[PDB]
Amino acid sequence: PPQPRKKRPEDFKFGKILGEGSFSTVVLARELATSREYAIKILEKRHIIKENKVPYVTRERDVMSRLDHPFFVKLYFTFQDDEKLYFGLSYAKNGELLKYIRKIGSFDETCTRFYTAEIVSALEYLHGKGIIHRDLKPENILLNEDMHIQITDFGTAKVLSPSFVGTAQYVSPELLTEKSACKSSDLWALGCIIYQLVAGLPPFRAGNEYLIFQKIIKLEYDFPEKFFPKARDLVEKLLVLDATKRLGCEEMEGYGPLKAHPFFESVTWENLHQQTPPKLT
Ligand SMILES: COc1ccc2nc(-c3ccn[nH]3)[nH]c2c1
């Protein structure tokens, strides 16, 4: 089937910078012919080559192409000039989730349940496709116009066949003990995010990267008294040192028992994207 002739930088009115990575920068752009707002990720080839990140960029482009679900940022086009790589991404109008965490303090039982369910529904999909995020954090979970999640940053994503260490606060213990990640890394990360939604802060916190890692392996963290009981139980079934005993993994019989947890008693999994998100306090 004949696809539209490659896009060019000149087809856009580039605007404000939205994000700044080490290898990339994300710019808000408006397609002139169509009036559309894309989040264009700009990567400089020389730097990618120099810093030996070609397989990283390849993987990213390949993984985003494989994704087709409403809780994920979509890839529309890719084009390149003499010095840069451009990725045409979906523009989440309301930005990062961390913005809403920091802005309202911490989430109520209804909000924590709805966004947790959206993240679970998203991971069930991603894992269904045998893809692992490897760096799931509130900085990577964005909010669209509708206030529904849109997961991004697939640079570090890994496609399983039959390495990289993410953000310190969300690193699972096994990553510090064998340098090996699986579906269970993403479930440990989810355990942190939930703790972060209820208590307004990540679970493991310390003066530097070393003390954080020390806390993670020792499993040194504690629930504030003002924490929902049902959410507390869920967080304890996820922040488990034994990677094979995390609620949601294949050893634990997958996503069935996770979605089945009392903290999601009222959640209707089958149509979250169609549901009207609760008002953020
Ligand atoms: C509230 O303003 C913002 C701030 C940062 C943003 N980053 C994206 C984005 C990245 C990839 N897709 N969308 N949209 C944003 C909106």
Residues 136, 256 within the same domain: yes
Residues 88, 205 within the same domain: no
Indicate the number of domains in the chain.
2
Which domain CATH number covers 52?
3.30.200.20
Contact predicate 63/157, CB 8 Å: yes
| Residues 6+ away with beta carbon under 8 Å from 85 | 42, 43, 44, 45, 48, 57, 78
Resolution in A: 3.0
Choose one of 24, 96, 141 to mutate for the ligand 1 pocket test, by most ligand atoms within 8 angstroms of C-beta.
Answer: 96
Distance separating alpha carbons of residues 150 and 108, to the nearest angstrom: 21
Name the phi and psi angles at 75, rounded to 5: -105, 125
Residues 78, 105 within the same domain: no
Contact predicate 172/189, CB 8 Å: yes
User: What spacing in Å lies between the alpha carbon of 87 and ligand 1's midpoint?
Assistant: 14
233 given a catalytic annotation: no
- In one letter, which amino acid is 175? L
* 22 assigned to a ligand binding site: yes
| Residues 6+ away with beta carbon under 8 Å from 91 | 18, 28, 37, 38, 39
3-state secondary structure of 41: strand
Q: Which letter, b or e, does each residue of 101-120 get, where b requires 16 or more Cβ atoms within 10 Å of its Cβ?
A: beeeebbbeebbbbbbbbbb
Domain boundary among 95, 123, 156: 95
Distance separating alpha carbons of residues 41 and 27, to the nearest angstrom: 6
- In one letter, which amino acid is 214? Q
| Residues 6+ away with beta carbon under 8 Å from 279 | none
User: CA angle, corner 187, sides to 182 and 193, nearest 5?
Assistant: 135
**Helix, strand and coil percent figures for the chain, each rounded to 5:** 40, 20, 40
Count other Cβ atoms within 10 Å, centred on residue 223.
16
Residues 156, 264 within the same domain: yes
Ligand 1 contacts (CB < 6 A) are: 18-19, 26, 39, 73, 89-92, 94-95, 142, 152
Phi-psi region of 157 (alpha: psi -120 to 50; beta: other; left: phi over 0): beta
Range of the domain at 26: 2-95
- With tokens 């549901």, the residue in question is 275
Q: How was this structure determined?
A: X-ray
State the chain's maximal CA–CA distance in angstroms. Answer: 60
